[PDB]
């Protein structure tokens, strides 16, 4: 009902409509069948203003969808640097891992999101985290052939 509308409004980037629905009692942490909350969808679609509103309105910054992905996972994968920073500003788990051990740093590293990898590292991202198949973010950058990124993630000892 109101939660459904709030999900679509966050997905569509309708900042005004998000505020209306919250004012009318929409559950800021409503979740669809896949477990996405409005903050998931806003981070995925890149709607920084809505992310801000949702967080001021009590959104769960560390909500997990059914795959273990948090809004920071989605912002990292989609390359939404501003949203990554805002989430981290609001206590997002920088080393949160999805169901196979994948952290946001892995997802940022996948797409060569250079500035995001740097922000994640600035906020305590652990370069030594491996997913279930032993892949660090540095390993991913090597596998994808991303030279500049490897130097930033490189461990020396």
């Amino acid at each position: 009902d109101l939660g459904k509308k709030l999900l679509e409004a966050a997905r569509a980037g309708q900042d005004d409509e998000v505020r209306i629905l919250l004012a009318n009692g929409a559950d800021v942490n409503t979740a669809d069948e896949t477990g996405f909350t409005p903050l998931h969808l806003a981070a995925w679609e890149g709607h920084l203003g809505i992310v801000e509103v949702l967080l001021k309105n009590g959104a769960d910054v560390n909500a997990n969808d059914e795959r273990g992905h948090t809004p920071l996972h989605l912002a990292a994968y989609t390359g939404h640097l501003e949203i990554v920073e805002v989430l981290l500003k609001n206590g997002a788990g920088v080393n949160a891992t999805d169901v196979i051990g994948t952290a946001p740093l892995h997802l940022a590293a996948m797409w060569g999101h250079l500035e995001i990898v740097e922000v994640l590292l600035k906020n305590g991202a652990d370069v030594n985290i491996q997913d279930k198949f032993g892949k660090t973010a540095f390993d991913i950058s090597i596998d994808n052939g991303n030279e500049d990124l490897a130097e930033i993630l490189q461990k020396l000892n």
Partner: peptide, 16 residues
């Protein structure tokens, strides 16, 4: 593994 991510049809891979 193919791991779906996001509300669409996207997926990342690691290993199998």
């Amino acid at each position: 593994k193919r791991i779906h991510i996001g509300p669409g049809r996207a997926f990342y891979t690691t290993x199998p």
